[PDB]
Design a protein around this ligand. Structure first.
Ligand SMILES: CC1(C)C(=O)C=C[C@@]2(C)[C@H]1CC[C@@]13C[C@@]4(C)C=C5C(=O)OC[C@]51[C@@](C)(C[C@@H]23)C4=O
Ligand SMILES: O=C(O)CNC(=O)C(=O)O
Ligand SMILES: [Fe+2]
Ligand SMILES: [Fe+2]
Lengths: 270, 265
């Protein structure tokens, strides 16, 4: 197996076949450039109400959920048709519905050392029961804000390591394949794929942001039930279901996250 | 394996050992008559107006046409969310069941189990059947969920008291359901509770009496599993009256995995 770079118009069955054979791939031009700029603008404006001027003439905010800080994220990025097409083919037949697991802005500082090589599904206890041929427990879409180079610690993966067994040792550093991307490209990251961020040996930050989804029956990393309800009703029904505001359906048609025996969105006037 | 009826003050690891041996047991006087009567008073009209049969269509054809199974118990009963969900036996067993592997646990779901007079026998089933990952689990693994079926009316063989097949929790994933003859009826007075791990094969009996047989259940499952019932549609003044334990049970607090990783944060 190898690391594949495919254009945006690659057929869905080709992307799924590459995901099954290599455990990862890169979809170039996943987002346009202005979308890349909008997400950084809204995040910067959130966590920093003040920016240093040229000379001396509430101040900052701790970062929160990406859907809270970025309106383009919760209203445009989370509606990405590629993510939903990949999530449906990955979780539909086995689990059925899926929803948002977690997401944040990647910020590799200058001089930051190499991240330990790991699989994303390590924090799932049921990963010990899972076989390499079973569907993934979660999938991550890592979008590039800056360019991803070997110098600035771009993401490295090991194609084929997703088919390793549960007791397999971590891949050697010599066999990690760096993911070279331009802003707008996305690296698709199933929870079975071993990966790690490299060391940033440059003088500039390596910036990115990630989305991630997992089956309906698994508890996500973040809860969004603290977001303002006026911010909830300006989302699409699909995004509302992603962020835990709607009832989900199992493959056996049993509904989880219900409002008693009814739908959660019906009981909340959504 | 055999069905055990133990008193309320039975040692906790004795209950855990019986759960490991026979896959089920009964804790008598699990609820005092005050709690049984308060729950019956707070859900009387709610069960009265509830339409029988399944509310929505799913593949587990198990809700008979003369069976009422309404949930939303915390929203409809203050005794349920302010006393029942704080029951020390539920948490003492859930800790030893889910702690050593999954870390935290929380509320999965809770329903009223109302058998109208004339209801036929329920299909024998395992409660974790709606878990897809149940086909990856082995009998020696920890349970995916645990249930506490508490008797509101008395539970007899004739009125449809729940029946269990002790030891069936050790059967493999492909083993056939128990025949009707190997089911053992559970005889419970108002107050007793039947402890049902997700692996125990069980079913409700036929209500061949003139009266309805009603109980109500509480279920808990690991922190990393999505509950069958959400509770964020409840009024906020209703959440502020819960204990910190119940607020965490019903999804209003951050959960801790076994390796100290935050979920639902
Ligand atoms: C379809 C039905 C009747 C069944 O045949 C097998 C499993 C489930 C899907 C029930 C209805 C709802 C549940 C959902 C819940 C989380 C709480 C309910 C309950 O309290 O009693 C039935 C349940 C159960 C014990 C079993 C579970 C469970 O674990
Ligand atoms: O009502 C009973 O005695 C048992 N009911 C169930 O197991 C159920 O509804 O899933
Ligand atoms: Fe990672
Ligand atoms: Fe059951």
């Amino acid at each position: 197996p190898q690391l594949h770079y495919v254009p945006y118009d690659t057929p869905v069955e080709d992307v799924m076949r590459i995901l099954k054979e290599s455990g990862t791939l890169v979809i170039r031009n996943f987002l346009d450039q202005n979308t890349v700029q909008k997400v950084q603008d809204e995040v910067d404006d959130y966590v920093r109400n003040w920016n240093p001027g040229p000379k001396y003439n509430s101040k900052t905010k701790q970062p929160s959920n990406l859907s809270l800080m970025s309106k383009t994220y919760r209203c445009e990025v989370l509606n990405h048709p590629w993510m939903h097409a990949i999530c449906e083919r990955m979780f539909g037949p086995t689990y059925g519905d899926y929803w948002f697991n977690g997401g944040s802005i990647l910020h590799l500082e200058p001089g930051e050392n190499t991240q330990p090589i790991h699989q994303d599904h390590v924090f799932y206890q049921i990963s010990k029961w899972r076989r390499p041929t079973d569907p993934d427990l979660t999938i991550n879409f890592t979008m590039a804000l800056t360019e991803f180079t070997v110098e600035n610690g771009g993401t490295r993966v090991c194609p084929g390591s997703h088919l390793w067994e549960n007791g397999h040792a971590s891949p050697a550093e010599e066999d990690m394949v760096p993911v070279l991307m331009q802003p707008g490209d996305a690296l698709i990251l199933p929870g079975s794929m071993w990966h790690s961020a490299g060391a940033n040996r440059t003088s500039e930050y390596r910036r990115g942001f990630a989305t991630s989804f997992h089956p309906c029956h698994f508890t996500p990393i973040e809860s969004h039930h603290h977001l303002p309800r006026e911010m909830v009703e300006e989302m699409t029904p699909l995004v509302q279901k992603m962020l835990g505001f709607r009832t989900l359906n199992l493959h056996n048609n049993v509904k989880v996250w219900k409002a008693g025996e009814g739908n959660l969105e019906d009981a909340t006037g959504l």
